[PDB]
Write a protein that binds this ligand. Structure first.
Ligand SMILES: *CCC(=O)N(c1ccc(O[C@@H]2CC[C@@H](NC(=O)N[C@@H]3CCS(=O)(=O)C3)C2)c(F)c1)[C@@H](CC(N)=O)c1ccc(Cl)cc1
Length: 148
């Protein structure tokens, strides 16, 4: 599950949850657990950062990728990977997609698929082996975050 395709599906499932367009039919047990936890983080970040989230105009996918790179470089600067930081990656892509829905020039219905790709690239290349060694999504993330 630490392969790119699995991570891409998690990132895309979370953007479809934020955008209220879940793929008709349903998400896996991993995505279901992740959407509750990442949404709780997302809402608190949006409340705390309300003032500064207006300091950018996310007019394009390249702007969103630049912002994502800056935020992730800062989030992981101490070299510490943990599950909280992994959930924060998904919460942050949720904030990005909401700003793109409002601000993207020539809004493209497939944009969430491009954001999903670069989120999955970051997760796989920068945290993938930490994730696998800590149980992957099914034996790590879900075991940590699934309901008591
Ligand atoms: C006011 C802040 C600001 O100007 N920008 C910004 C910076 C960071 C950010 O989100 C980060 C991800 C969520 C949060 N981290 C966090 O809660 N980490 C905790 C400690 C480790 S843990 O995982 O346990 C939890 C901060 C923002 F959403 C916004 C801007 C930064 C920039 N590079 O311009 C900014 C970025 C993006 C947008 Cl859309 C708007 C402003």
């Amino acid at each position: 599950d630490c392969e790119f395709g699995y991570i891409y599906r998690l990132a895309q499932d979370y953007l479809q949850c934020v955008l209220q367009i879940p793929q008709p039919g349903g998400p896996s047990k991993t995505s279901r657990v992740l959407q509750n936890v990442a949404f709780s983080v997302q809402k608190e970040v949006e409340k705390n950062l309300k003032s500064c989230l207006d300091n950018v105009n996310v007019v394009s996918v390249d702007t969103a990728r630049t912002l994502f790179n800056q935020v992730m470089e800062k989030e992981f600067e101490d070299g510490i990977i943990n599950w909280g930081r992994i959930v924060t990656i998904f919460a942050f892509e949720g904030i990005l997609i909401k700003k793109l829905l409002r601000q993207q020039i020539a809004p493209d219905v497939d944009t969430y698929k491009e954001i999903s790709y670069f989120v999955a690239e970051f997760i796989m290349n920068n945290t993938g082996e930490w994730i696998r060694q800590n149980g992957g999504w099914e034996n790590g993330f879900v075991k940590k975050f699934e309901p008591k």
